Amino acid sequence: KQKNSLFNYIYSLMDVRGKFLFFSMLFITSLSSIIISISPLILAKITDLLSGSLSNFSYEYLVLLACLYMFCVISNKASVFLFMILQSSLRINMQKKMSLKYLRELYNENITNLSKNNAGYTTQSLNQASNDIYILVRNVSQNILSPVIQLISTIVVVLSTKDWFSAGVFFLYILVFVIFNTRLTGSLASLRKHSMDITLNSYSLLSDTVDNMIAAKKNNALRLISERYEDALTQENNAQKKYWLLSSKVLLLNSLLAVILFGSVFIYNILGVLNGVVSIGHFIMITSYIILLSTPVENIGALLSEIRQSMSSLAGFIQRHAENKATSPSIPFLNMERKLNLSIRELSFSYSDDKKILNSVSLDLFTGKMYSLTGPSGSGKSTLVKIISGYYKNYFGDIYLNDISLRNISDEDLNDAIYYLTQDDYIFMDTLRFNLRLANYDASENEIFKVLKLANLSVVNNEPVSLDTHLINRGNNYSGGQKQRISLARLFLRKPAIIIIDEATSALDYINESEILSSIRTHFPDALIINISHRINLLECSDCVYVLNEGNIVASGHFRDLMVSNEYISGLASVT
Amino acid sequence: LFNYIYSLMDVRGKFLFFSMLFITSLSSIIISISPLILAKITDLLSGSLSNFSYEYLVLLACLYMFCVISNKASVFLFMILQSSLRINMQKKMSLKYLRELYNENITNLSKNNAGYTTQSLNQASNDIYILVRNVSQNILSPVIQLISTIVVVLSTKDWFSAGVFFLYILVFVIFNTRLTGSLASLRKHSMDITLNSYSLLSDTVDNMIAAKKNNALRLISERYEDALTQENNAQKKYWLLSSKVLLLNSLLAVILFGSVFIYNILGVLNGVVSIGHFIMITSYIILLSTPVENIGALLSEIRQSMSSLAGFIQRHAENKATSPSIPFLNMERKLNLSIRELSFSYSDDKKILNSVSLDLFTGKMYSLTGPSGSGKSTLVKIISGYYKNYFGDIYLNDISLRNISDEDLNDAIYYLTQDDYIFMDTLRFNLRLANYDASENEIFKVLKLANLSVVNNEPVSLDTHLINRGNNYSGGQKQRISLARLFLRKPAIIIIDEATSALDYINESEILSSIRTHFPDALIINISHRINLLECSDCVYVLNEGNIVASGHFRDLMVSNEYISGLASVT
Ligand SMILES: Nc1ncnc2c1ncn2[C@@H]1O[C@H](COP(=O)(O)OP(=O)(O)O)[C@@H](O)[C@H]1O
Ligand SMILES: Nc1ncnc2c1ncn2[C@@H]1O[C@H](COP(=O)(O)OP(=O)(O)O)[C@@H](O)[C@H]1O
Ligand code: VO4
Ligand code: VO4
Ligand SMILES: [Mg+2]
Ligand SMILES: [Mg+2]
């Protein structure tokens, strides 16, 4: 069942030009194997015409025979060049469609599954899959019809000349070969998959070390860094050497079998020629078939290996990327209001197992009101707002948005209703314009520049900020606070009912922090605001404060009514 | 270039490479006898065919079979040795890259992402492979087969055949070398666009959550689709030139070798040329395709894999400037810092530090504050030796920073960065980054001082696996990993750049207390917008638009300076 889905996926990557290039590749490979299967007869016909005549034969017929053999050789080589030209054209063609399908498939994946592996890994995963497709496309377009044609004609013709020992041992070889190899193909595929997986692990570790180079440099940790890569490379080599040995043995054994079987057919026909039983023409024909048969035997060997091993390695890729189990019963086009109230009822959560992060969070929040959420680091403030922001779906309890449950809200609608300002910044390596267009695609040049003022990013170091400012990897082109302001400017282009600020202002100075937080409430008057902070001034300003401790909400109400009652907030309000 | 590829080969690597060259050379000698054996077989068919001439035909047929068998055994043996050599050279190449990346400057490292550096290694691996191959297979072997052909056809005194044969190799080597550079440039430019495309994929995948939550599939997809379109167009441009060269080389071969075939046909029809010679000539025409092809590869492949590999060495080894300083263990126990008229620019277009003049001393805690964009991080980064292109001077007990080895500087100073750098590995590995030789106890002791020995009423294991960017942990728990590192280190200067922002007042004060206790003589610079650290410091420094605008005690500054007055009023 998964075998059919695999080839349908490869077929789908081919547009109209792609389908033609693939069929042209199949046709040309098939046509040339018909033509080249004729050539050992031509050679035999040349041999007899000369043998046993003392220059007494049609010289015009020898020339016609020599020219037909040349046509065979020329057409077969033209076919090889034409196939490889079509092959590269089809690679180029299928490449783009393959790569976008991956990116679009990655976008539709859940946060939990995305977080599992780094960019180094996902980047080399595409690499392996692209190459795997390539191999499969080739093996199908070249090693299916062509070797069958050349092997059928060879047994048919050798059977026709009533040579039973030759056609017998010939058919015996293809039988012993196809059996022996298939009885060792899976064993190679498994050794190859396991190797390619270790290879992903190795690229994963390289990107992990390169992304945190600064840390390893500053701690003078070259030894620790180098050793864990050297270990990964050693796991890679050993996994590769294990494949190499099996591959080398199969090849040696297949070679020795060919030498024993085809060698006998050669000695048999030698003795047949020496005892006048077999003609020289026929001897040359059997000699010519033995030589010609190597390439279709090679193409079969390849197919049996390459098809099974690229199918296995490609199966594994489709698995860890399309395990789509979501299908949450969402309301079709249920547009959300200006004023939305949140209701969290007995919410429970665990990231893995073994540990519960949220005990039984019961909360009730309303439109146009600002709420503060605090507690020690490890309580689960981020976790709670992430669940509200639909990062995670396997939660116990219920979350409502004016009677409508989160479970019945589409991830697109939820993301339009709520805007989460993350603890960590996510700045795209692109223009400032691009980073802000992330919030709203259709935003005009003015709407974007207006938003810079609101985030206090219209002027940097008494100089006007350009929308074409190129932003380096992780936006380290900008200061900690300037990074936070990019993410803040995004909120102003969006139009949400709920606004979550998870320690999203921590890197800003008192002036900026207050001015932006002011502009937020001004621009979004009816917006419900959840604010996560460890600071009294951000807690003071709220309509109500919530204290989270080890998963459970331990205290509620006004900050002033809590700064003496609650153990945590009294600990914060220890500021002289 | 070839010295670099040679260096990647150990003893097993050098053997495998020479075995590959030998076997390729030996088989081309053997297969160059082949058309003469075919001639003798054609001679016998139209000649001697007595009992002895039948036995001579069989011994001849066996020699041709030996040629064909030995040539194929050689092909299989070469590919076995090639893969063995690939495996062999692979590890040595990859570590050289990592070690080369570690020794690069922060400014150059920041220039490209992981997606880019990862696929950069990929391209160079493949470029080495091609070069190793074209050298071990397409140099001696085609020369042997082309020399012997012209020698033998010259010997049978056929001038038109050996003439047009030599003419082809001459026209071929000329025509192709004329277009090789044009192909290499089109290929390099394509491979570079390919890096740009992998760079954009890793950039999008690393910031997927942002694009997902902003429902930005269209903007994200469009950007990649554009990059892929720049990739296809760069690839199609190479494809066409490649396809033209191949079709023109094919048409030239059909015209020149076709003539040699027609000439010898007419020679056979007019009794001028024997059938035995006619076969030997077509047998040489057929045989010559593979050495012509291997020269076609050698000419084109050696040049294009040298161009793209030249680029890779350029961007990963150019460091013409190197200050021959070297004063060793520049400091012991105690340290003082002296910044004199420090000025700095990142891209020279704008000045970040105007003329910072500061003086700091042992055992004293100092606070540095100012608006976001003033340059607090910039200044401490320069103190931490991130950048060396600065005007002015920085001293560390009379010794200038310029004369302090990056190793010694990193042992004297410990910078706790604004952003956290958690390795995807065990907690043990993340802390062993600070001190390799640290014992299980030294590491666990440090976990307590970091307030990380217990998470959610459970004791923290040193074998805790930490996901990509340490997102397996809370913002504050990430900061505590970086803080736990400091307690394994032994510095004279300790910089805390907003390194406790994600921590609550209880832990911030509790850890900051254990820092001062464990490092009593340590000079401490603290960058904070909060006051619970500014009030605690022996002196406060206010940075505004590059220049240090205010100094002294915090209390004496919330009277004098309006910024410090306004900040304290947040009570
Ligand atoms: N690596 C960099 N490349 C270019 N410009 C940078 C870089 N890092 C920071 N900047 C610029 O230098 C200014 C000062 O740097 P920084 O220390 O990060 O500011 P802050 O006072 O917020 O700590 C920033 O406002 C920013 O525009
Ligand atoms: N993505 C995650 N995967 C696994 N564990 C996590 C994740 N995020 C946080 N945790 C765990 O959950 C707890 C609290 O998480 P978090 O919401 O980030 O904390 P905080 O109270 O600082 O907001 C921690 O004890 C931490 O180990
Ligand atoms: O790990 V937290 O308390 O959001 O900073
Ligand atoms: O970018 V700074 O947060 O150190 O103001
Ligand atoms: Mg949090
Ligand atoms: Mg800073």
Place of tokens 């020795």: A256
Q: Do B57 and A537 touch (CB under 8 A)?
A: no
The answer to whether B506 and A571 are in contact (CB under 8 A) is: yes
Mutate which of B455, B474, B483 for ligand 3? The one with the most ligand atoms within 8 Å of its CB, which is: B474
CA of A564 to the centre of ligand 5 (A): 24
Angstrom distance (rounded) from CA A387 to CA A500 = 12
Q: How far apart are CA B316 and CA B99, in angstroms?
A: 11
**DSSP letter string, A523-566:** H-TT-EEEEE-S-HHHHHTSSEEEEEETTEEEE-S-STTTTTT-
Radius of gyration of chain B, Cα coordinates, nearest whole angstrom: 36
Q: What is the DSSP string of B492-556?
A: SEEEEESTTTTS-HHHHHHHHHHHHHHSTT-EEEEE-SSSTTTTTSSEEEEEETTEEEE-S-STT
Query: Of A298, A317, A308, nearest to A190 (Cα)?
Result: A308
Nearest Cα neighbor of A548 from A341, A402, A393, A344 is A344
Cα(B206)–Cα(A119) distance, integer angstroms: 6
CA angle A137-A139-A140, nearest 5°? 65
The rounded distance, in Å, linking the Cα atoms of A143 and A26 is 9
What's the Cα-to-Cα distance from A437 to each of A442, B204, B214, B217, B366, rounded to whole Å?
8, 14, 9, 12, 41
User: Crossing angle for the helix pair A59-107 and B275-314, nearest 10 degrees?
Assistant: 20
* Chain B residues with beta carbon closer than 8 angstroms to that of A486: none
End-to-end CA distance of chain B: 66
Burial of A495 (0-12, 13-18, 19+ CB in 10 A): middle
Question: How many residues in chain A?
Answer: 576
Categorise residue A445: left if φ over 0, alpha if ψ from -120 to 50, beta otherwise. Answer: alpha
Residue nearest to atom 3 of ligand 3 (CA): A377
CA of B20 to the centre of ligand 5 (A): 59
CATH architecture of structural domain A333-576: 3-Layer(aba) Sandwich (3.40)
CA B321 to chain centre: 21
Which of A107, A202, A471 is the best residue to mutate to test the B interface, defined by the most B CB atoms within 10 Å of its own CB?
A: A107
Nearest Cα to Cα of residue A251 among B10, B43, B82: B82
* Ligand 5 mean position, distance from CA A380 (Å): 6
DSSP-derived secondary structure for B284-296: HHHHHHHHHHHHH
Which residue in A491, A26, A51 sits closest to A283, CA to CA? A51
**Token pair of B458 as six digits:** 């459970």
Q: In whole angstroms, give the CA distance from residue B269 to residue B436.
A: 85
Encoded tokens for A18: 């792609």
- Distance (Å, whole) CA A230 – CA B454: 33
For residues B511 and B503, the answer to whether their CB atoms sit within 8 Å is: yes
Helix (H, G, I), strand (E, B) or coil at B394: strand
Provide CATH 3.40.50.300 ranges for chain B.
Answer: 328-571
- Interatomic CA distance for residues A50 and B57, integer angstroms: 14
Residue in the structure block whose two tokens are 């009533």: A162
Closest Cα to residue A286, out of A301, A302, A271, A298?
A271
What is the number of other CB atoms lying within 10 angstroms of the CB of residue B273? 19
First-residue to last-residue Cα distance in chain A: 71
Whole-number Å distance between alpha carbons of B126 and B308: 10
**Residue nearest atom 3 in ligand 2 by C-alpha distance:** B472
- Tell me the C-alpha distance between B494 and B411, whole Å: 11
Strand order in the sheet with A342-349: A358-364, A342-349, A396-401, A404-405
Taking the CA of residue A479 as reference, the ligand 4 atom at the shortest distance is 1
Tokens 């489709």 -> residue = A318
Q: Which of B466, B475, B420 is nearest to A502 (CA)?
A: B475
- A415 and B CB contact within 8 Å: yes
* Nearest-5° Cα angle at B159, B156 to B163: 125
Nearest residue to B164 (alpha-carbon basis) of B284, B38, B42? B284
The one-character DSSP state at A477 is T
Cα-to-chain-centroid distance, residue A178: 33
CA distance B440 to B432: 10
3 state SS of A403: coil
Which residue from B422, B413, B412, B416 is spatially nearest to B511, judged by alpha carbons?
A: B416
Pocket of ligand 1 (CB under 6 A): A 460, 476-482; B 346-347, 352, 370, 372-378
Both tokens of residue B58?
Answer: 């069989």
| Domain span(s) for CATH 3.40.50.300 in chain A | 333-576
At residue A468, φ and ψ (nearest 5 deg) are: -95, 10
Q: What is the C-alpha to C-alpha distance for residues B6 and A526, in angstroms, rounded to an integer? A: 70
B287 alpha-carbon distance from chain centroid: 41
Cα separation values, A553 from A358, A360, A373, A527, B147, Å: 9, 8, 9, 23, 88
Which residue out of B376, B378, B381, B528 has the highest number of ligand 4 atoms within 8 Å of its CB and is therefore the one to mutate?
A: B376
Element (H, E) at A399: strand A396-401
Q: At what angle do helices B159-206 and B217-269 cross, to 10 degrees?
A: 170
B372 in a known ligand binding site: yes
User: How does B426-459 read in b/e, with b if 16+ C-beta sit within 10 Å?
Assistant: ebebbbbbbbeebeeeebbbbbebbbbeebeeee
Closest C-alpha among A60, A69, A29 to residue A150: A29
Q: Which residues contact B255 (CB under 8 A, 6 or more apart)?
A: none
Contact (CB, 8 A) for B405 and B326 = yes
Q: How far apart are CA A68 and CA A46, in angstroms?
A: 11
* Binding site membership of A381 for ligand 3 (Cβ less than 6 Å): yes
CA atoms within 13 A on the CB side of A533: 26
Residue B310 in contact with partner chain A when CB distance is under 8 A: no
Residues with beta carbon inside 6 Å of ligand 2? A 351, 357, 377-383; B 455-456, 471-476
- Nearest-CA neighbor of A439 among A474, A489, A505, A498? A489
Q: State the best of A267, A510, A515 to mutate against chain B, taking most chain B CBs within 10 Å.
A: A510
Do A216 and B433 lie within an 8 Å CB cutoff? Answer: yes
CB contact under 8 A, B114 and A114: no
**Angle formed at CA A280 by CA A276 and CA A284, multiple of 5 degrees:** 140
Break-preceding residues in chain B (C–N over 2.5 Å): none
Torsion angles phi and psi, residue B491, rounded to 5: -95, 165
**Is some CB atom of chain A closer than 8 A to the CB atom of B224?**
yes
What is the count of residue pairs from A and B with beta carbons less than 8 Å apart?
395
Instruction: Specify the fold of B328-571.
Output: Rossmann fold (3.40.50)
- Alpha-carbon Rg of chain A, whole angstroms? 36
Q: Using a CB–CB cutoff of 8 Å, tell me whether A203 touches chain B.
A: yes
- Give the CA distances from residue B489 to residues B165, B412, B526, in Å, rounded to whole numbers and listed in that order: 73, 9, 18
Burial A371-382 (b: 16+ CB within 10 A, else e): bbbbbbbbbbbb
Mutation to test the A interface, candidates B118, B217, B532, most A Cβ within 10 Å: B118
| Contact (CB<8Å) A206/B121 | yes
* Burial B403-419, CB ≥16 within 10 A → b, else e: ebeeebbbbbbbbbbbb
For residue A316, the tally of other CB atoms under 10 A from its CB is 17
Residues 6+ apart with CB under 8 A from B532: A575, B505, B508, B509
Distance CA A342, CA A362 (A): 11
Distance CA(B504)–CA(A533), nearest Å, equals: 9
| CB atoms near residue B542 (< 10 Å) | 22
Q: Which two tokens mark B556?
A: 């004496």
> 3-class SS at B96?
helix
Do the Cβ atoms of A458 and A464 come closer than 8 Å? yes
| Helices vs. strands in chain B: H and E counts, helices first | 19, 12
Structure tokens at A368: 């146009």
The residues, any chain, with a CB within 8 Å of residue B467's CB and separated by 6 or more, are A115, A116, B424
SS3 for A514?
helix
Beta bridge partners of A344: A363, A399
Length of chain B: 571
Whether chain A has a CB inside 8 Å of the CB on B204: the answer is yes
Shortest alpha-carbon distance between residue B285 and chain A (Å): 10
Q: Which two tokens stand for residue B197?
A: 């495309």
Residues of B in contact with A270 (CB under 8 A): 58, 61-62
Interface of A with B in 517-546 (CB under 8 A): 534-537
Q: Which amino acid is at A303?
A: L
Encoded amino acid at B333, one letter = R
Q: Tell me which H or E stretch contains A371.
A: strand A370-374
Contact A575 B532 (CB under 8 A): yes
Burial of B187 (0-12, 13-18, 19+ CB in 10 A): buried
Give which of A89, A514, A50 is closest to B41, Cα–Cα.
A50
Q: State the DSSP code for A498.
A: E
CA distance linking residue B276 with residue B40, whole number of Å? 7
Residue B495: name the closest of B393, B391, B378 by CA: B378
CA–CA separation, B458 and A551 (whole Å): 14
Q: How far is Cα A484 from Cα A506, in angstroms, rounded to an integer?
A: 8
Quote the CA–CA distance of A313 and A129 in Å, as a whole number.
8
3-state secondary structure B329-369: CCCECECCEEEEEEEEECCCCCEEEEEEEEEECCCCEEEEE
Asked if A210 and A329 count as a contact pair (C-beta separation under 8 A), the reply is no
Tell me the ligand closest to B471's alpha carbon.
Answer: 2
Separation of alpha carbons A135 and A11, rounded Å: 14
Chain A contacts in chain B segment 101-130 (CB below 8 A):
101-102, 106, 109-115, 117-119, 121-122
Is the distance from CB of A485 to CB of A508 less than 8 angstroms? yes
- Paired tokens of B370: 């100012």
Ligand 5 centroid distance, CA of A50 (Å): 91
**What values do phi and psi take at B156, rounded to 5?**
-70, 10
- Cα distance between residue A120 and residue A125, in whole Å: 8
Ligand 3 binding pocket mutation candidate from A532, A550, A572 (most atoms within 8 A of CB): A532
Which residue in chain A is spatially nearest to B544 when comparing CA positions? A461
Alpha helices in A116-221, H assignment, sequence order: 119-143, 145-160, 164-211, 213-218
- What's the angle, vertex CA B524, arms to CA B523 and CA B528, rounded to 5? 160
- For residues A56, A57, A62 and A65, what is the CA-based torsion angle, rounded to 10 degrees? -140
Contact B543, B379 (CB under 8 A): yes
Experimental method: X-ray
Q: How far apart are CA A200 and CA A320, in angstroms?
A: 13
Question: Under 8 Å CB-to-CB from A245, ≥6 apart: which residues?
Answer: none
Give the integer Cα–Cα distance in Å for B415 and A218.
8
Phi, psi dihedrals of residue A333, rounded to the nearest 5°: -110, 65
